[PDB]
Amino acid sequence: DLYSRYKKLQQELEFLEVQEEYIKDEQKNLKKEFLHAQEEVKRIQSIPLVIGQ
Amino acid sequence: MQNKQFRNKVLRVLVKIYMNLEKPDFINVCQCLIFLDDPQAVSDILEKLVKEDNLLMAYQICFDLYESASQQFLSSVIQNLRTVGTPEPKDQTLKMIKILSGEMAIELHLQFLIRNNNTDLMILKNTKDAVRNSVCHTATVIANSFMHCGTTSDQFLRDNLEWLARATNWAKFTATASLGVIHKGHEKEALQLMATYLPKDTSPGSAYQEGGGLYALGLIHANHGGDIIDYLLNQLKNASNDIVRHGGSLGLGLAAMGTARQDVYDLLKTNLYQDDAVTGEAAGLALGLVMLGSKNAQAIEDMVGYAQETQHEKILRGLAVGIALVMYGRMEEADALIESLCRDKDPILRRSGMYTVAMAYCGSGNNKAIRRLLHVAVSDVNDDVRRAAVESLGFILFRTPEQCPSVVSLLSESYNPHVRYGAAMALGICCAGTGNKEAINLLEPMTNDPVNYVRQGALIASALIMIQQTEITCPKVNQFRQLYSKVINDKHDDVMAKFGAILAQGILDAGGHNVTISL
Amino acid sequence: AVQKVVVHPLVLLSVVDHFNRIGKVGNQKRVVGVLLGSWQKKVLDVSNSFAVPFDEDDKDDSVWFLDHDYLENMYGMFKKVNARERIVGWYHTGPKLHKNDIAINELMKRYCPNSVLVIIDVKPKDLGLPTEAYISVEEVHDDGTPTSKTFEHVTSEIGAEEAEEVGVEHLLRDIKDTTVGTLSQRITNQVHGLKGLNSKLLDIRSYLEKVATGKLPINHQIIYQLQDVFNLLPDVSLQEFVKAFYLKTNDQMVVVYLASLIRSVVALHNLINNKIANRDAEKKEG
Amino acid sequence: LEEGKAGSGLRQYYLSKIEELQLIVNDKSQNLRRLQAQRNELNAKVRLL
Amino acid sequence: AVDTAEQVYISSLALLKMLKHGRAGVPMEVMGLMLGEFVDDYTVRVIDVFAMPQSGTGVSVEAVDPVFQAKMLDMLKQTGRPEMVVGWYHSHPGFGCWLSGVDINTQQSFEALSERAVAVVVDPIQSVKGKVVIDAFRLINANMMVLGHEPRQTTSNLGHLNKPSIQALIHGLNRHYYSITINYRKNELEQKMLLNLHKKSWMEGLTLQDYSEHCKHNESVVKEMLELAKNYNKAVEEEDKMTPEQLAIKNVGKQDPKRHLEEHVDVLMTSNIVQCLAAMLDTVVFK
Numbered sequence A: 001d002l003y004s005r006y007k008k009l010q011q012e013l014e015f016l017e018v019q020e021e022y023i024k025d026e027q028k029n030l031k032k033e034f035l036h037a038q039e040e041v042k043r044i045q046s047i048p049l050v051i052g053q
Numbered sequence B: 001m002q003n004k005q006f007r008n009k010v011l012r013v014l015v016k017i018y019m020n021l022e023k024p025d026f027i028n029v030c031q032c033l034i035f036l037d038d039p040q041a042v043s044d045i046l047e048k049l050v051k052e053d054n055l056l057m058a059y060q061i062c063f064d065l066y067e068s069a070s071q072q073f074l075s076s077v078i079q080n081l082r083t084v085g086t087p088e089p090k091d092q093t094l095k096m097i098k099i100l101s102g103e104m105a106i107e108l109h110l111q112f113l114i115r116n117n118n119t120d121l122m123i124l125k126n127t128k129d130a131v132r133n134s135v136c137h138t139a140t141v142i143a144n145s146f147m148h149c150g151t152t153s154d155q156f157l158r159d160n161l162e163w164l165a166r167a168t169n170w171a172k173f174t175a176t177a178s179l180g181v182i183h184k185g186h187e188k189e190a191l192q193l194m195a196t197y198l199p200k201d202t203s204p205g206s207a208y209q210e211g212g213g214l215y216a217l218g219l220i221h222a223n224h225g226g227d228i229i230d231y232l233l234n235q236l237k238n239a240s241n242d243i244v245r246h247g248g249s250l251g252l253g254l255a256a257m258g259t260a261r262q263d264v265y266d267l268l269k270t271n272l273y274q275d276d277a278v279t280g281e282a283a284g285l286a287l288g289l290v291m292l293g294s295k296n297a298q299a300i301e302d303m304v305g306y307a308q309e310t311q312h313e314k315i316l317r318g319l320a321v322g323i324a325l326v327m328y329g330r331m332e333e334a335d336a337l338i339e340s341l342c343r344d345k346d347p348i349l350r351r352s353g354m355y356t357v358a359m360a361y362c363g364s365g366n367n368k369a370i371r372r373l374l375h376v377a378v379s380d381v382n383d384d385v386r387r388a389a390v391e392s393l394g395f396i397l398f399r400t401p402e403q404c405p406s407v408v409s410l411l412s413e414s415y416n417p418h419v420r421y422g423a424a425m426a427l428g429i430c431c432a433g434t435g436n437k438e439a440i441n442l443l444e445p446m447t448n449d450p451v452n453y454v455r456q457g458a459l460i461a462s463a464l465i466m467i468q469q470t471e472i473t474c475p476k477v478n479q480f481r482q483l484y485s486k487v488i489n490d491k492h493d494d495v496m497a498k499f500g501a502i503l504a505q506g507i508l509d510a511g512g513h514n515v516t517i518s519l
Numbered sequence C: 001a002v003q004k005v006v007v008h009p010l011v012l013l014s015v016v017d018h019f020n021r022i023g024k025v026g027n028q029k030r031v032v033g034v035l036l037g038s039w040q041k042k043v044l045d046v047s048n049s050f051a052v053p054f055d056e057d058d059k060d061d062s063v064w065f066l067d068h069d070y071l072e073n074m075y076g077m078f079k080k081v082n083a084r085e086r087i088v089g090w091y092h093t094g095p096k097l098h099k100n101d102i103a104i105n106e107l108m109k110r111y112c113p114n115s116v117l118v119i120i121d122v123k124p125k126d127l128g129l130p131t132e133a134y135i136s137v138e139e140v141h142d143d144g145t146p147t148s149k150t151f152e153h154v155t156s157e158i159g160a161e162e163a164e165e166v167g168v169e170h171l172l173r174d175i176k177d178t179t180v181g182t183l184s185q186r187i188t189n190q191v192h193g194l195k196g197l198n199s200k201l202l203d204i205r206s207y208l209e210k211v212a213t214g215k216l217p218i219n220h221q222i223i224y225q226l227q228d229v230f231n232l233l234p235d236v237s238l239q240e241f242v243k244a245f246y247l248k249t250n251d252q253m254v255v256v257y258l259a260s261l262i263r264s265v266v267a268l269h270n271l272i273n274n275k276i277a278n279r280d281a282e283k284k285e286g
Numbered sequence D: 001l002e003e004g005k006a007g008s009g010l011r012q013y014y015l016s017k018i019e020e021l022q023l024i025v026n027d028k029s030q031n032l033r034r035l036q037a038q039r040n041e042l043n044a045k046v047r048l049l
Numbered sequence E: 001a002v003d004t005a006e007q008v009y010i011s012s013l014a015l016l017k018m019l020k021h022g023r024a025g026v027p028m029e030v031m032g033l034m035l036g037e038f039v040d041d042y043t044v045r046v047i048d049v050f051a052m053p054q055s056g057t058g059v060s061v062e063a064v065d066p067v068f069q070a071k072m073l074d075m076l077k078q079t080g081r082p083e084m085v086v087g088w089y090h091s092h093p094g095f096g097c098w099l100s101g102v103d104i105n106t107q108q109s110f111e112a113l114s115e116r117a118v119a120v121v122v123d124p125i126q127s128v129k130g131k132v133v134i135d136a137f138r139l140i141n142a143n144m145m146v147l148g149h150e151p152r153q154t155t156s157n158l159g160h161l162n163k164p165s166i167q168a169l170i171h172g173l174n175r176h177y178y179s180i181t182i183n184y185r186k187n188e189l190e191q192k193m194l195l196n197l198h199k200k201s202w203m204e205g206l207t208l209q210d211y212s213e214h215c216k217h218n219e220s221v222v223k224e225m226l227e228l229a230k231n232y233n234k235a236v237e238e239e240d241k242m243t244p245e246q247l248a249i250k251n252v253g254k255q256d257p258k259r260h261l262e263e264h265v266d267v268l269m270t271s272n273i274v275q276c277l278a279a280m281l282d283t284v285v286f287k
């Protein structure tokens, strides 16, 4: 189990390594979706309107 | 995480050590035979059973080899063992007959499941209280099918006939199918009980009883050597529309699974040549089952050629699952095909690629798939492939239950609720049968959300964990109470909410805690 | 007369409908439809249109089929429901300009006022602008060739009025708006090179070929002005533009200062919290 | 001998340094996924809006 | 007495035609028709959609001219549009998208032929441009009041039908009334064509035209905007001089809703235009 710990840990290494491109995709895409929704709720606001008090 | 290019040869050259010893070991030969799946590997040990002249040691290996972990390998080894011997002479005959039987296990299982039954009135009373005539009507009978499975008790449904046939709908079909779930492993009393209902004019007003009887028959005779299929062909030859085509495709398709016959393939083709979506979907579901391991050359191009030429979604998803389930051991083969079909315009086929690569890469042997899985999950705007994303992920990562909730922790609360739903299914299938609390402690934020989808998925995920677990070791009291509050909160909740609720409650009460699930 | 025109995506989507309802004929030749718009205002505006059957002959190219009755009926009903739009001209989906098109347009040149011709492609593999507005007028030729109908290129733009933008944006959910920033600008700064590359490569090759290897005097005279435009930039040594480069690089320095200073301001809260929050959380942890 | 308790030992300790690098990968993934959850929380907030 | 799950297929054709019908959605009552082909019972597809001339009578069964209808339909038959009418659509501006007595009566009269009779009501007037999402309508039978209301399977799409979440009209008019789900369809041709056309709509003809314009406008126009940007940034900085005092006093809780960060970040994003167009000018000068 001592020498097996290495070979067993390699799987965890690859598993933790594969998450890099994943979080890259998330952080790059969700900000684009963020500005998307931002402009979506921004275009809701229009100049012509009624003035209250 | 081997690529199988070496390990198979390593094992097959490592199985020569114990045969030279004083006694053989069952564990290593089983673990190897379920891996390399080589017909020549079992070739010596099958013929050594006669040489060793020992009956008791052969029973174990025969039973556990014929129990699972193969289909066509078993179909090959049964005729291979049939060839060996006469076409202790008298002992070898009864031995070779009894080892491939397999009915004994079904008998003892059905028996102990018949005598272990323990039921409570509170649950069924609650179901009869929370029942509706539209939505959860199917949930009640599927819950009944869950709890009454294996005990073959129709006495619960013998209470009243006005709780079933009072209205004409698919609910009666799901009820008959539920009855098919209740009793299983009957070569006589099944068809007998099905024909005992209305053997008068042989013309029932509801065909859902006949079609549901065919589907139930397919459920019962599935994976058996007592197949009525020969009669099922002529029974499918009958003149009808909805039930014969659909129910027949489902039943006969499930009964013919593993046979890999070209006849059922042909009749399935002439069944899907009517361009209809429903019977073609059933045709897809059946084809995926019967063509497993066969891998026909022109089948793929024929189906993908039949894909984009129809606008119906049902035939699309039907062929999707059809080409998804048919793919096994293609890890070193179908990579180019999946990569080519990944860029397709069709969302259904895009999900079909993931469902196809799902079972093919199972066993965590490929780290390449999850790249484009997560990529198409995050990048693509359509919630279809996003909710179809992490299912394959859970399928390939099913080996380690602990690592899943960590990487799906970000998908716990997502942007679109569909991703939360798929992630709920992921936590449901990955943590199923295990004791992992990483999902459990995260179930609390999941049980309450403005969206009903993620809530229902959380109910299912919570249903797939607490099953077969001791209460004294872990504090499940909270989630048990919040699950038991779902039935009293049904009035203040959504119509589908109570549906998924009682459906989640039907999981734990299924089989009376006796039967469980294992990946 | 008309400086620029406005072409709405609706008509091209109607061409998509033309490629829709085909139903696997095995002919799929050029189809001439009838474009509708407002010729009242100086700038042309396209709202909607309809479709009329158009067929030709394999061998003889002089064969063209139109319908007066169907046209008068469709335009009649369309004028009945909407009086804010009238007839303007026609269009074809043919990638190439046939010689018979002058005779096809001659009809609407007689019955109707001057018509504008629009040329598009059957397969949207073209990266450039699919719609080219061509006005039909008679111009005096310098070489002395007999007066004939000449198609002059008119600039155009693709836009929508109000709801069509919403419909498109909803049906797509893919394309992004202007969105001033890094990626939106750098994407253009990347692909534009290819936008010029494929176009120029598709042009100058056939140009070089047809100039030396070809005939039918299309009046090459304008191409001397082309080459002249190519000679308008005789490899400037930038020696006079050095000061301009200095000012531009100075503005770049301004961008540097602004960026550095602002980021230095933003770093405040981060390089405070990273300490004060962590030390407090750690000391209050146990 | 002087290998398994020496060479394999320093190999396992090299693997521990690898565990340190993967610890950097670990907490980088942690703060990145926390920022991810933050941006997702704000996106869910404007979604509620 | 059999009922299945139906789903209405909507293409870009009918959508855009209902947008033009939205421009035609003036308070004057209008009429419309929808055409298509029925392959089976539980699916419905619409393709050909046109408008109808306005009248002073408004929407009524008498308003529809049968001979003119059959005439136009025949004119569609001689052409490449061989589809039967799948129903009719209209607009109900300002009083709500619901159906009145006359409307449900002429609906009852027009559903005598087709059992489906898809009903679509578009009202862009009070509808924000943020969402073009529309809800199709259906007509329940009057003899089903004894049994259950809607015997429809596939209940998973009701959450997608939950888009009209208004707390008044839905369960208010829910009696003898209901709706149906809506989905779209898109192929590669429409996708590529519309995407390229829209990208070109946001782009130029030769695409090299208006770029160099702004590139050379960076030294004229943008400069003033940069000066104003520095003015606002300084207007923030004068408060940022007051901030370290508060940071030296309280540090507990945030009483200032102003982020002061992301805005300046966006200012930097607008400042990066010079850097991005610098390489552009380099490419223009070089070759």
Ligand SMILES: [Zn+2]
Pocket (backbone or CB within 6 Å): E092, E093, E095
């Ligand atoms: Zn009104």
